[PDB]
From Swiss-Prot, chain A:
It comes from Saccharomyces cerevisiae (strain ATCC 204508 / S288c) (Baker's yeast). Changing D21A: Alters protein folding. Severely impaired growth. Strongly reduced growth at 35 degrees Celsius. It is found in: Nucleus. Changing D21N: Reduced growth at 30 degrees Celsius. Strongly reduced growth at 16 degrees Celsius. Component of the U4/U6-U5 tri-snRNP complex composed of the U4, U6 and U5 snRNAs and at least PRP3, PRP4, PRP6, PRP8, PRP18, PRP31, PRP38, SNU13, SNU23, SNU66, SNU114, SPP381, SMB1, SMD1, SMD2, SMD3, SMX2, SMX3, LSM2, LSM3, LSM4, LSM5, LSM6, LSM7, LSM8, BRR2 and DIB1. Changing R105K: Severely impaired growth. Reduced growth at 30 degrees Celsius. Strongly reduced growth at 16 degrees Celsius. This is Pre-mRNA-splicing factor 8.
Curated annotation (Swiss-Prot), chain B:
It comes from the Eukaryota. Keywords: Cytoplasm, mRNA processing, mRNA splicing, Nucleus, Phosphoprotein. It holds the Pfam family AAR2_1st. Changing S236 to D/E: Disrupts interaction with PRP8. The modification Phosphothreonine is found at T257. This is A1 cistron-splicing factor AAR2. InterPro entries: AAR2, AAR2_C, AAR2_C_sf, Aar2_N, AAR2_N_sf. It comes from Saccharomyces cerevisiae (strain ATCC 204508 / S288c). Changing S236A: No effect on interaction with PRP8.
Amino acid sequence: GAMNSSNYAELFNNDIKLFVDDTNVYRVTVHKTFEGNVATKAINGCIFTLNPKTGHLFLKIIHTSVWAGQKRLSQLAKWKTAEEVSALVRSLPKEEQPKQIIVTRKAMLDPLEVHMLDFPNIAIRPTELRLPFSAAMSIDKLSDVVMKATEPQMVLFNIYDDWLDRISSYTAFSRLTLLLRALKTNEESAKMILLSDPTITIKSYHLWPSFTDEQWITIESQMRDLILTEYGRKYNV
Amino acid sequence: MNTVPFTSAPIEVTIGIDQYSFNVKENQPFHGIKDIPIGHVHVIHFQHADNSSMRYGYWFDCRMGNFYIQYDPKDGLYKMMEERDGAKFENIVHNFKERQMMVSYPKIDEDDTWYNLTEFVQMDKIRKIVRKDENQFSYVDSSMTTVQENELSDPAHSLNYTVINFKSREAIRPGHEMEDFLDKSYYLNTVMLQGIFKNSSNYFGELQFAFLNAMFFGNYGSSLQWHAMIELICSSATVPKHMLDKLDEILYYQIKTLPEQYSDILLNERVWNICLYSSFQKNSLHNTEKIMENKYPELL
């Protein structure tokens, strides 16, 4: 069934699993027409498919051309996400195919179950976790490869950089969810915190800065503060 | 006009015949049911006074043989049996009739209710769903599970309804996942109508047989099969006009006959709200929507 706080350590066991987040698949800007009606213009999207154990991100870029002359786009987006995840799975060798796929939105269950009928042993699960994977487009290099894409593309990243050299997958996922929660709550402030010291750079092959263990504790502390302030503001408490 | 004689009534019992029922007292001189209309299937059904659990009964057609009921004190139920001796049977029936020991099938001449509930139901199809080939009649009870319920456990005592599963390789063509899930026309028309049932008459017969099992025995798997078969039509964009017109007529008489007080257990809120209000056929079931809205507005 559903993945919650109670079964949280299961994310870091040796059963291959993938989170699928479809939030950034169908992206639009809403604008006024010359006649003063409203109209949407789609921009490039992305499926956010993550192994939480390894940090291996499968970023399927959804180019605007996939929407051309299609109807009910927000429904189609769920199905197209399900098609692409099913295609990814089939493309992996048997021993790399997941034993579970956790969707971050319950509306993805039926599309994904139906696209995965050929895989009866892969469990499709919802989650009670409010995961901030929507903020993935606040990571500059991910945002950059999506917006530049001129055709459908799959780009492979490690969202944990080299962190698993020094910390466990539990701690790496905690760090990642904290950075993404910060970026989601106040993007400007989060990005300021991450780059305010110019001596700390992002390696060409990395997504986040090259922080020492001490510096990660300072950063993580600054991210917690950012999240609580914004909360106190939101709710006047 | 045909007859199902009873050898005796040794235990107090509520006896059902189609949509009618009679209380019989323990050792009452009851010797059966006469004037049973030829041309339809019938169901004789039982609910013991002492144990109001296990409703149970027999589907039969009088054209196929001479049938009687006899209590078995060992297995503790009213059993149907066939009498092969035509002259012994005629002589039993004439005696009980002369002594007026038989209730008359109480059909009102205006009243097409049974016809309307069993229009497509045929004994040959019931005997493929309920497999006991040595008998020309079929036993069903409250507790009998379906082939589909089993898969999710004694195969002999199962209800072999056609398995319908919206999230099955049967229901979904590879590369038509969204089309086939959101519009079940290919499942309905190619897989089920052309493929399995052969024609809408077999499909409607199973639908109507499933409802009657749900209504008369409170058989839960029967109710599930009845709703699945309604849902497959209503969830299909492409249905022959004649099938939609007939479905409206079928469903109207099922809703019309349902005991008012069992609507809560026999009707699936999600299926009915989806079929009448959300589905492709939301506007194709005028009679059904009007009786549902007038008789069970709570459910909707």
